[PDB]
Amino acid sequence: DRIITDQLDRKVTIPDHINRAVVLQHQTLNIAVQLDATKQIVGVLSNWKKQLGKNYVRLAPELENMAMPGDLNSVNIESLLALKPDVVFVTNYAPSEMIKQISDVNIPVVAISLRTGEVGEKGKLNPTLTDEDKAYNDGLKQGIELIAEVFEKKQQGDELVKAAFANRKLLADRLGDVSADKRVRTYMANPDLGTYGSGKYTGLMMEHAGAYNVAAATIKGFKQVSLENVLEWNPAVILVQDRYPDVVPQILNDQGWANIQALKDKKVFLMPEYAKAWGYPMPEALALGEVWLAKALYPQRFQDVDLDKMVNDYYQKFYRTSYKPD
């Protein structure tokens, strides 16, 4: 057996080889797809189609007939045990009650946060972090490395980590003279007036692309806000995650949003599949999404950057398929 330490700082004994993993978190699921580990998975979170978006099943068609014995914050133990799982990955904020149910029937649990930062905060959906860039950078690296350890995909895990951070220098160099006054004021519109404030990867994606999350000085983490807040923030650009495409026409047809700068200027943009301005960091979000956003906001700085080719090279390696625009 092996002992690992998870991202809740839990010491966890697991089998030498893992072939029946149950993955109750979409971020870990996506990393495992990119490690070519899906043959070692036998169950996934029930809401995977919602969390990964309707086209995800093109990348991982095997997910279609995968048992679903739980979700982000609950588990069905009778369903779970039928799958004879050898490990369960859960999200870092999974309730204590849920982790206990799984540990009480002796299945190893590995919690994934994709963040280091303050230990007092590791189990919180919405953390307060003193150095969010380093927390998520180090957490991403650590989390991929742990996932890769569990599934014995060490080499691909190392390649994935290198690919995630490969364009961070380019963006640093090309946008290093962007003053705080000139930084592009950006809003992430999730369904039902959802948005991301502080302590979330969303804001960091925007920073690395020469932008700023308008919600982040007053909103903590993932929260429902009022239209009135969005009106006051008056963002220059509104972004929508690819997994929630209905939100774009919804904003564009809602008269109450019509006077926001981004509406007047026709800067409401559905973000590409890979360009996940999520609460959590994902390797393709760094490698490809951050470049997409930088190129969208500063195109005259990145004309030499062949993003189409970068996307293709990445997808062929980690998704074993081409990128298909929606």
What angle do the packed helices 132-151 and 26-34 form, to 10 degrees?
60
Q: Where would I find the beta strands (DSSP E) of the chain?
A: 2-5, 11-14, 21-24, 41-44, 87-91, 109-112, 184-188, 194-196, 211-213, 222-224, 237-240, 268-270
DSSP run (H or E) holding 292: helix 290-297
Closest residue by Cα to residue 263 from 293, 227, 289, 295: 227
State the burial class of residue 151 (Cβ atoms within 10 Å of its Cβ: 0-12, 13-18, 19+).
buried
Asked if 52 and 29 touch (Cβ cutoff 8 Å), the reply is yes
Measured between alpha carbons, how far is residue 2 from residues 12, 38, 112, 117, 303 in Å? 8, 21, 17, 25, 48
Look-up of token digits 């390649």: 159
Q: d(Cα 234, Cα 247) in Å, to the nearest integer?
A: 18
Torsion angle defined by CA atoms of residues 14, 15, 17 and 19, in that order, rounded to the nearest 10 degrees? -80
Q: d(Cα 235, Cα 261) in Å, to the nearest integer?
A: 6
What was the resolution (in A) of this experimentally determined structure?
1.7
Backbone angles phi, psi at 250, to 5 degrees: -60, -40
Closest residue by Cα to residue 207 from 262, 153, 300, 134: 134
Look-up of token digits 């690395």: 208
Asked if 278 and 241 touch (Cβ cutoff 8 Å), the reply is yes
Experimental method for this entry?
X-ray
Measured between alpha carbons, how far is residue 21 from residues 15, 60, 286, 310, 311 in Å? 11, 16, 26, 31, 29
Closest residue by Cα to residue 28 from 109, 105, 156, 114: 114
Binding residues for molybdate: 26-27, 196, 243, 279-280
User: Within 13 Å of residue 129, how many CA atoms lie on the same side as its CB?
Assistant: 27
* Structural domains of the chain, with CATH: 1-165 (3.40.50.1980), 166-326 (3.40.50.1980)
Measured between alpha carbons, how far is residue 305 from residues 46, 172, 291, 294, 314 in Å? 38, 14, 9, 11, 15
Buried b (16+ CB within 10 A) or exposed e, 60-83: beebeebbbbbbbeebeeeebeeb
DSSP letters, 141-193, are HHHHHHHHHHHT-HHHHHHHHHHHTTTHHHHHHHTTT--TTTSEEEEE-BTTT
User: Within 13 Å of residue 55, how many CA atoms lie on the same side as its CB?
Assistant: 12
Q: d(Cα 304, Cα 254) in Å, to the nearest integer?
A: 38
Determine the residue type at 242: D
Q: d(Cα 326, Cα 319) in Å, to the nearest integer?
A: 17
Q: d(Cα 95, Cα 265) in Å, to the nearest integer?
A: 43
Look-up of token digits 């895990």: 157
Asked if 139 and 113 touch (Cβ cutoff 8 Å), the reply is yes
Look-up of token digits 């998520």: 136
Closest residue by Cα to residue 235 from 295, 275, 184, 283: 184
Q: d(Cα 176, Cα 155) in Å, to the nearest integer?
A: 33
Q: d(Cα 43, Cα 54) in Å, to the nearest integer?
A: 18
Please name the residues in contact with 169: beta carbons below 8 A apart, sequence gap of 6 or more: none
Q: d(Cα 84, Cα 124) in Å, to the nearest integer?
A: 29
Q: d(Cα 248, Cα 5) in Å, to the nearest integer?
A: 41
Q: Is 234 left (phi over 0), alpha (psi -120 to 50) or beta?
A: left
Asked if 148 and 22 touch (Cβ cutoff 8 Å), the reply is no
Tokens in use for 314? Answer: 């990445």
Backbone angles phi, psi at 109, to 5 degrees: -120, 130
Binding residues: 26-27, 196, 243, 279-280
Please name the residues in contact with 270: beta carbons below 8 A apart, sequence gap of 6 or more: 240, 242, 245, 248
Q: What is residue 305's three-state secondary structure?
A: coil
Tokens in use for 176? Answer: 């290093």
Q: d(Cα 265, Cα 222) in Å, to the nearest integer?
A: 26
